[PDB]
Write a protein that binds this ligand. Structure first.
Ligand code: K
Length: 305
């Protein structure tokens, strides 16, 4: 009796959970039976935002550069016929090769090492046995953990040739993220970013997801500040040099409303239309921001080939 909102279905069974060799340092939730993070739990509910020290900034620069490396490994596998589980296996091995833990794995018992979100999946898709299809759009989200620091990014990819609506949605979502990043500097309120993002999305006939937001990220996977991507939100806080957080707008072809599959993770549009996302981890500097998850070797995201 769960009624799917679109054409996608989960493709089970999932391969048994992949172990991480014990020489890899693990975050606190990695061994919690329900994947709860006592770190996040202890600060649960705070508004105070960490000011990163010099050591912290080096730790974030490193983990975010490695996360970008792993996203670029995933990008090069996107093609019709490849399953999202195959992408996840490659990601898992690439994390370990970089002496990192794949942060999604066992986070609140999430069963895989990355999230793969096809078409109507807004976010948190679970890699499974479905082969990607020509015309699909697919987001891969990569978070790594190294020396106690997490770093997150994601990009949406085209699978083969896609339609004009897919290109417009993905281009517009990428523009929303970059307009938001351009506004980031000391003294800007965190609530302003959603105003920027929604203005661009709405001018292009798209909606903005409301149930998921950007967030502080560093020694905690998710912490203050909360960064909504829609307009006239009530986010608390003002950017300061030393703040680190994600911006990760989720833009929909139809309505903004979301619902979750029975698996407890996969977020889909309620109307079954497509969604796209891009994400970077940002460090606010004395005058602007440092895009810690930027590509270093190419000017553009992968969908612009
Ligand atoms: K999607």
């Amino acid at each position: 009796p769960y009624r799917y909102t679109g054409k996608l279905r989960p493709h089970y069974p999932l391969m048994p959970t992949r172990p991480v060799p014990s020489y890899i340092q693990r975050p606190d939730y990695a061994d919690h039976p329900l994947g709860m993070s006592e770190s996040e739990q202890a600060l649960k509910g705070t508004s105070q935002i960490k000011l990163l020290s010099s050591e912290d900034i080096e730790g974030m620069r490193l983990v975010c550069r490695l996360a970008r490396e792993v996203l670029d490994v995933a990008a090069g596998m996107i093609k019709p016929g490849v399953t999202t589980e195959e992408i996840d296996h490659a990601v898992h091995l690439a994390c370990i090769a970089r002496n990192c833990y794949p942060s999604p794995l066992n986070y609140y018992n999430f069963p895989k090492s990355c999230c793969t979100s096809v078409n109507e999946v807004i976010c948190h898709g679970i890699p499974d046995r479905r082969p990607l299809q020509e015309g699909d759009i697919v987001n891969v989200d990569i978070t790594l953990y190294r020396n106690g620091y997490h770093g997150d990014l994601n990009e949406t990819f085209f699978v083969g040739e896609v339609d004009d609506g897919a290109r417009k949605l993905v281009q517009t979502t990428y523009e929303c993220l970059m307009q938001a990043i351009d506004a980031v500097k000391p003294g800007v309120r965190y609530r302003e970013l959603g105003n920027i993002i929604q203005k661009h999305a709405q001018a292009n006939g798209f909606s903005v997801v409301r149930s998921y937001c950007g967030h502080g990220i560093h020694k905690l996977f998710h912490t203050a500040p909360n960064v909504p991507h829609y307009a006239k939100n009530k986010a608390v806080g003002v950017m300061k040099s030393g703040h680190v957080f994600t911006i990760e707008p989720m833009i929909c072809e139809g309505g903004w409303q979301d619902e979750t599959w029975p698996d407890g993770w996969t977020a889909v549009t309620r109307d079954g239309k497509r969604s796209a996302q891009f994400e970077h981890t940002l460090l606010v500097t004395d005058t602007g921001c440092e895009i810690l998850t930027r590509r270093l070797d190419s000017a553009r995201p992968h969908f612009m080939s």
